[PDB]
Amino acid sequence: RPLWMPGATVPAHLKGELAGDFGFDPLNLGKDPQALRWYQQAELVHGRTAMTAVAGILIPGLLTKAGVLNVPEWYEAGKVSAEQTGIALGPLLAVQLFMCGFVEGKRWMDFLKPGSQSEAGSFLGFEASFKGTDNGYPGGPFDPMGMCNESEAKTKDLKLKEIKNGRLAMLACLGFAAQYGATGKGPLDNLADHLAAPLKTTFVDNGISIPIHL
Amino acid sequence: GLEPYLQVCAGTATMLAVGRFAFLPLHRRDLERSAATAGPKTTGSTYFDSLQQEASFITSTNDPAGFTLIDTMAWGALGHALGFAFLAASSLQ
Amino acid sequence: RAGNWLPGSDAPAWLPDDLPGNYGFDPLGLCKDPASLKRFTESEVIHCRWAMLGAAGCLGVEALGFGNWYDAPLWAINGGSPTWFGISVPFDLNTLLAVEFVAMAAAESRRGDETDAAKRIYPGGAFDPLNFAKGDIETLKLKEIKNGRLAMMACLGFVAQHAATGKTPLQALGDHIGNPWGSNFATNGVSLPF
Amino acid sequence: RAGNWLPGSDAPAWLPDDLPGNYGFDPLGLCKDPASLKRFTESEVIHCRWAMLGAAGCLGVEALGFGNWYDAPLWAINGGSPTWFGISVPFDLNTLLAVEFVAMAAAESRRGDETDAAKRIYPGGAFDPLNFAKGDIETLKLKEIKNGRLAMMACLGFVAQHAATGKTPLQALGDHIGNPWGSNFATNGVSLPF
Amino acid sequence: DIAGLTPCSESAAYAKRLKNEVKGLNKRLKNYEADSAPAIALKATIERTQNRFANYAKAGLLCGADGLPHLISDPGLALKYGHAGEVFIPTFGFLYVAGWIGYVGRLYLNMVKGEAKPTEKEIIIDVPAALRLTWQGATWPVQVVAELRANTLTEKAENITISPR
Amino acid sequence: VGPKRGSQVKILRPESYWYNQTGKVVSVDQSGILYPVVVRFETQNYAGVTTNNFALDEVQP
Numbered sequence: 001r002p003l004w005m006p007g008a009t010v011p012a013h014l015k016g017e018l019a020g021d022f023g024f025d026p027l028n029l030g031k032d033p034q035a036l037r038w039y040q041q042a043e044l045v046h047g048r049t050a051m052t053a054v055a056g057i058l059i060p061g062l063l064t065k066a067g068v069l070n071v072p073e074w075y076e077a078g079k080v081s082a083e084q085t086g087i088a089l090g091p092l093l094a095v096q097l098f099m100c101g102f103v104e105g106k107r108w109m110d111f112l113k114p115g116s117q118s119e120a121g122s123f124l125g126f127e128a129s130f131k132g133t134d135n136g137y138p139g140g141p142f143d144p145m146g147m148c149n150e151s152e153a154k155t156k157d158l159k160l161k162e163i164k165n166g167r168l169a170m171l172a173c174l175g176f177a178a179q180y181g182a183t184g185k186g187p188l189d190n191l192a193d194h195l196a197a198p199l200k201t202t203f204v205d206n207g208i209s210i211p212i213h214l
Numbered sequence: 215g216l217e218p219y220l221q222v223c224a225g226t227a228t229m230l231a232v233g234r235f236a237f238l239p240l241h242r243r244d245l246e247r248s249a250a251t252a253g254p255k256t257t258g259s260t261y262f263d264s265l266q267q268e269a270s271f272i273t274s275t276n277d278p279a280g281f282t283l284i285d286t287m288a289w290g291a292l293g294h295a296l297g298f299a300f301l302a303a304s305s306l307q
Numbered sequence: 308r309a310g311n312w313l314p315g316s317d318a319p320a321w322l323p324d325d326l327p328g329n330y331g332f333d334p335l336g337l338c339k340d341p342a343s344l345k346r347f348t349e350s351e352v353i354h355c356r357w358a359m360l361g362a363a364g365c366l367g368v369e370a371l372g373f374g375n376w377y378d379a380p381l382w383a384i385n386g387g388s389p390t391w392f393g394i395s396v397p398f399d400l401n402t403l404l405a406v407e408f409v410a411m412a413a414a415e416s417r418r419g420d421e422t423d424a425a426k427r428i429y430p431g432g433a434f435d436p437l438n439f440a441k442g443d444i445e446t447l448k449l450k451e452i453k454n455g456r457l458a459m460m461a462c463l464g465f466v467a468q469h470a471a472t473g474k475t476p477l478q479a480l481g482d483h484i485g486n487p488w489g490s491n492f493a494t495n496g497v498s499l500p501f
Numbered sequence: 502r503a504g505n506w507l508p509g510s511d512a513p514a515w516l517p518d519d520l521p522g523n524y525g526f527d528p529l530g531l532c533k534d535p536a537s538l539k540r541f542t543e544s545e546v547i548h549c550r551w552a553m554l555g556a557a558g559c560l561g562v563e564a565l566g567f568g569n570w571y572d573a574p575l576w577a578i579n580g581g582s583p584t585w586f587g588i589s590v591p592f593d594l595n596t597l598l599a600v601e602f603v604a605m606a607a608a609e610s611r612r613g614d615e616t617d618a619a620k621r622i623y624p625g626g627a628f629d630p631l632n633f634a635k636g637d638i639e640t641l642k643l644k645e646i647k648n649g650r651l652a653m654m655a656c657l658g659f660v661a662q663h664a665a666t667g668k669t670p671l672q673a674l675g676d677h678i679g680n681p682w683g684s685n686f687a688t689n690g691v692s693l694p695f
Numbered sequence: 696d697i698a699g700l701t702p703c704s705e706s707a708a709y710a711k712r713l714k715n716e717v718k719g720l721n722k723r724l725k726n727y728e729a730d731s732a733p734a735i736a737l738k739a740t741i742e743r744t745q746n747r748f749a750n751y752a753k754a755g756l757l758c759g760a761d762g763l764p765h766l767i768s769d770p771g772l773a774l775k776y777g778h779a780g781e782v783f784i785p786t787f788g789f790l791y792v793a794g795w796i797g798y799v800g801r802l803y804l805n806m807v808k809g810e811a812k813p814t815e816k817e818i819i820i821d822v823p824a825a826l827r828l829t830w831q832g833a834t835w836p837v838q839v840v841a842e843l844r845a846n847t848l849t850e851k852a853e854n855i856t857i858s859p860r
Numbered sequence: 861v862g863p864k865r866g867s868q869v870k871i872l873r874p875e876s877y878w879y880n881q882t883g884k885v886v887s888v889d890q891s892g893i894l895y896p897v898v899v900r901f902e903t904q905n906y907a908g909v910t911t912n913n914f915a916l917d918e919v920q921p
């Protein structure tokens with residue numbers, strides 16, 4: 001089985017089953033089966049959220065830097081949209097919290113009790129759809145085009161593609177924040193500046209990554 | 215009129231009436247359970263400690279519902295402190 | 308029951324199924340003790356009835372056009388006269404306080420004295436003149452308890468909005484409909500910290 | 502069945518073959534539960550009948566030439582007058598809202614008060630004055646649902662044309678007829694990106 | 696602002712405290728030749744002082760009439776007025792390391808418990824296994840909670856010896 | 861009679877340094893000895909003793 005590091009000792013609770021099980025639990029965090037299950041759902045949610053966010057920071061930018069759109073920088077769009085829409089931060093956030101809270105509540109209870117949201121009579125007409133299939137995979141209303149119903153090996157491929165792309169997107173978001181935090185420019189700007197003089201424009205030569213006093 | 219009589223009389227009357235027909239039964243019921251059940255009997259015996267022992271004049275009132283003199287001096291006392299808190303409050307404050 | 312507070316949850320066994328309004332909501336398990344459950348059940352209906360009357364009165368005094376729920380005991384301080392539907396009532400806070408005391412001192416003691424634990428919350432009889440209970444009472448009880456939980460919450464809303472928004476319930480509503488996103492608990496100053 | 506949503510598929514099996522309007526189109530599988538099956542069926546027909554009435558009113562008023570559907574609910578904002586078929590009506594916003602609520606409440610309640618379920622979808626009797634439901638009812642229902650589904654889609658079209666084009670549905674129709682290759686959803690500037 | 700505490704940048708006493716403190720070192724520099732190590736040293740103390748007595752004000756440290764910077768503890772006051780770097784933020788920093796040290800310790804204790812003679816691995820510490828558990832305490836908060844929500848952080852009350860009442 | 865030799869039993873004697881704690885049954889005198897179950901403990905009392913004879917009722921496997 002592919003491992004995060006060749007020769008690394010596979011833990012024990014990480015038996016090839018979860019999508020992306022490369023045997024990486026150095027600090028034995030997922031030792032508890034319940035903890036591992038919650039962490040698995042947490043990972044999927046983190047990856048999916050990051051993938052749908054880095055796509056909203058890179059894609060819109062690459063097209064702005066190609067003249068197609070005019071979207072502002074991810075670290076400036078917030079203010080631009082606030083002054084554009086006119087909605088006050090407070091009201092905008094509060095509404096979002098309530099809507100996100102309700103959807104999170106349903107998913108949360110579905111974990112606490114698997115396939116429980118499909119209670120007879122709960123969500124008017126739809127409870128059935130709110131059943132769920134496996135931990136972080138609410139098949140049905142989600143995955144409408146039925147791509148995870150083709151075979152039992154297209155599921156295991158499409159699921160390794162979600163996790164590897166997610167893990168990458170999650171690290172990409174951390175990078176974008178750190179890049180702007182140190183460089184003070186957009187991600188594309190950083191990449192372009194690096195490709196210009198690759199051997200003279202790195203995190204070392206930024207002034208913030210390593211405060212070299214000596 | 216509106217002299218001390220109006221305030222004192224009203225307070226006394228209301229408290230006595232409310233304690234003679236409204237809280238009187240609750241008052242009796244609370245007295246029983248408190249002194250007979252959870253609380254037992256005091257002044258077992260011996261010594262001139264009969265002072266702590268219940269009197270008798272208090273338990274001698276033909277008044278229906280057994281409104282004893284202590285009850286009349288109880289609700290009435292509560293009433294004479296409302297008549298004098300209402301008049302006094304209007305005096306200043 | 309009547310539903311589930313959290314579609315998916317279960318249990319609240321300490322809360323019986325017959326209890327009028329059992330949606331299962333007892334997270335802090337305040338109804339486990341049977342005795343406490345009895346008192347809490349009776350108090351809820353008592354609170355609902357009072358809450359429903361209050362909410363109606365708070366909006367009525369404003370809807371008909373005679374003032375607001377807050378600025379009503381103002382006459383007793385400003386130095387004016389009582390005014391029901393405009394008609395000046397000939398009384399003073401002192402005589403009203405006394406009338407209330409004796410009135411509540413008798414009715415409330417009478418209800419509390421009654422020991423049936425089923426007719427202390429649902430007396431019926433003179434309290435049910437049109438005899439609407441006949442034919443089915445559970446649904447009406449659910450509507451009474453459900454409409455009341457709406458009123459108890461509303462009555463809190465009027466006080467809270469007056470405390471922060473500083474506006475009458477009807478007026479505050481118009482403010483929201485006016486600029487919804489710009490006239491909420493958030494754009495107020497007291498509700499949210501930031 | 503009335504056909505197939507995707508000729509060559511077979512996935513829908515929970516849907517009964519006798520269900521009026523059964524084209525076998527359930528991509529998210531919402532009709533599996535029989536209770537949800539009945540509810541969705543009743544909701545669909547209701548939505549269809551309303552949409553059919555709305556579409557007739559939205560364009561009808563324009564045909565006769567008394568204004569567009571969007572301009573109807575504006576007089577009250579400007580404090581103007583209501584006018585049906587040109588003839589004036591002496592009402593206002595709050596009174597209209599109140600009269601509507603009560604009427605809709607007493608009517609919709611009774612419809613839902615029904616238990617046979619089939620009647621909730623097709624009551625007939627007083628709702629069948631001409632009694633055209635003597636025969637060919639099974640196919641006339643398909644016409645009712647097919648026209649109804651089209652009516653609901655058409656209603657969305659009116660809103661979308663007004664949202665993007667802004668012009669009235671009849672006007673927008675003429676614009677396309679006059680300049681088909683020039684005027685279209687593709688050139689509205691809202692349908693396509695940015 | 697806050698409790699009559701003027702900002703050190705606007706604190707005159709803070710400025711005097713600088714003037715008089717650098718003068719007290721510029722009088723000890725005179726009794727020494729310009730190049731002597733004594734003098735190179737006193738000039739570093741004057742530079743270091745002039746940097747600190749400015750890094751503090753630039754950090755918006757409110758100081759009283761004494762001219763000595765004061766700290767705000769209330770989270771609301773510290774956060775609302777940008778005084779989080781003092782006490783507030785430092786608080787969590789210690790808590791994280793504190794729990795890290797404690798969690799790593801219990802991890803080792805509970806591993807040597809059972810292992811042969813657990814009492815001889817407390818005196819002669821197993822430096823290898825002690826070095827394999829230090830980094831495990833990095834995500835201690837995640838693991839500690841997972842133990843609360845699993846009933847494994849504490850012991851049953853019927854397995855802990857108690858003194859006769 | 862008594863817990864099996866080698867069996868670990870939770871001490872139930874209140875004034876026992878090893879109360880609520882477990883120990884291995886070294887032996888159980890099958891006579892009428894008041895306290896017959898000899899229990900050994902890795903921990904030692906304040907005196908330094910690491911064992912004690914507990915009655916059958918003072919031990920719970």
Ligand code: CLA
Nearest residue numbers: 496497498499500501697768769770771772773774775776
């Ligand atoms: C450790 C104990 C402790 C103590 C003794 C205090 C004491 C105080 N806090 Mg506080 N606070 C604490 C913990 C504590 N806090 C913690 C753990 C948090 C994190 C949740 C906060 C977050 C917090 C905030 C956000 C605020 C305070 C504020 C205050 C002051 C007035 C607020 C109040 O009435 O009660 C205490 C209030 C709380 C404990 C939290 C609720 C937030 C308060 C109620 C909002 C009040 C805003 C208003 C401006 C306060 C008026 C103060 C007056 C001098 C004008 C007060 C001296 C207010 C302040 O002075 O900052 C400007 C304020 O805004 N605190």
Ligand code: CLA
Nearest residue numbers: 796797798799800801802803804820821824825826828829
């Ligand atoms: C794994 C080591 C460890 C851990 C996790 C704890 C944890 C705890 N101790 Mg404790 N303690 C320890 C060692 C430890 N102690 C040692 C060695 C001594 C002898 C000096 C004490 C003496 C002591 C006293 C007198 C008290 C506590 C108390 C407490 C509790 C209060 C929390 C606190 O602030 O800590 C407090 C910690 C101290 C006061 C001193 C210990 C600090 C040392 C430096 C930490 C131990 C590091 C350890 C050597 C690392 C081993 C790693 C391994 C690989 C070798 C807490 C649960 C209090 C309590 O009982 O609360 C009710 C209390 O009264 N401890």
Ligand SMILES: CC1=C[C@H](O)CC(C)(C)[C@H]1/C=C/C(C)=C/C=C/C(C)=C/C=C/C=C(C)/C=C/C=C(C)/C=C/C1=C(C)C[C@H](O)CC1(C)C
Nearest residue numbers: 051054055143144145147165168169172175176179187190
């Ligand atoms: C469910 C459903 C249903 C049915 O089935 C069908 C369908 C519809 C299809 C489905 C859907 C799905 C989805 C949504 C998906 C998504 C995806 C994504 C977005 C990904 C991302 C993903 C993303 C990612 C990876 C990211 C990446 C990024 C990166 C690397 C970055 C890098 C960088 C850094 C750091 C910084 C600098 O300065 C710059 C650079 C150098 C540039």
Ligand SMILES: CC1=C[C@H](O)CC(C)(C)[C@H]1/C=C/C(C)=C/C=C/C(C)=C/C=C/C=C(C)/C=C/C=C(C)/C=C/C1=C(C)C[C@H](O)CC1(C)C
Nearest residue numbers: 332333334335336337357358361364365376379459462463
């Ligand atoms: C369930 C549960 C379970 C778990 O365990 C815990 C928890 C969660 C905590 C719980 C909860 C609870 C709750 C919610 C409660 C509520 C309460 C209320 C709010 C009441 C009201 C209440 C309210 C009410 C009565 C109201 C009242 C009112 C009245 C009388 C009257 C008034 C008025 C009016 C007419 C007007 C004028 O101008 C003035 C006046 C004269 C003044």
Ligand SMILES: CC1=C[C@H](O)CC(C)(C)[C@H]1/C=C/C(C)=C/C=C/C(C)=C/C=C/C=C(C)/C=C/C=C(C)/C=C/C1=C(C)C[C@H](O)CC1(C)C
Nearest residue numbers: 526527528529530531548551552555558559570573653656
């Ligand atoms: C089958 C399936 C299967 C899978 O699984 C899932 C899914 C996909 C979800 C499903 C689907 C569904 C759907 C399609 C739905 C649709 C709906 C609609 C559109 C409705 C409308 C609806 C619509 C409607 C009712 C309409 C209404 C209207 C009305 C009343 C009226 C109006 C009007 C007129 C006369 C005129 C004037 O001047 C104004 C007004 C007064 C304003």
Ligand SMILES: CC1=C(/C=C/C(C)=C\C=C\C(C)=C/C=C/C=C(C)\C=C\C=C(C)\C=C\C2=C(C)C[C@@H](O)CC2(C)C)C(C)(C)CCC1
Nearest residue numbers: 768769770782783786793794795796797798801835839848
């Ligand atoms: C916001 C904050 C403060 C506010 C404090 C306030 C208002 C309340 C504080 C309550 C506090 C600090 C503590 C309450 C603790 C109660 C309990 C039951 C927690 C016990 C913690 C336990 C048992 C954990 C122990 C650990 C385990 C098991 C493993 C390792 O993690 C190590 C260890 C020993 C930590 C202020 C003082 C202003 C200041 C600014 C930071």
Ligand SMILES: CC1=C(/C=C/C(C)=C/C=C/C(C)=C/C=C/C=C(C)/C=C/C=C(C)/C=C/C2=C(C)CCCC2(C)C)C(C)(C)CCC1
Nearest residue numbers: 226230277286287288289290291292293294295296298299
């Ligand atoms: C017989 C009879 C009856 C009755 C009558 C009467 C008239 C009663 C009353 C009685 C009374 C009449 C009671 C009262 C009591 C009271 C008391 C005994 C006390 C008083 C006083 C006080 C309590 C005061 C105190 C104080 C002072 C000293 C000073 C200042 C402060 C104060 C005010 C606090 C009738 C007719 C119905 C009928 C039948 C018969």
Ligand SMILES: CCCCCCCCCCCCO[C@@H]1O[C@H](CO)[C@@H](O[C@H]2O[C@H](CO)[C@@H](O)[C@H](O)[C@H]2O)[C@H](O)[C@H]1O
Nearest residue numbers: 236237240243346411412415416417418419420421422
């Ligand atoms: C703005 C006005 C705000 C409210 C003012 C009044 C506050 C509420 C009344 C406080 C005094 C209550 O006084 C008394 O309370 C007890 C306690 O339940 C009631 O007691 C009643 O219920 C208890 C419940 O256990 C029974 O045991 C008792 O037999 C019965 O009489 C009395 O009927 C009531 O007369």
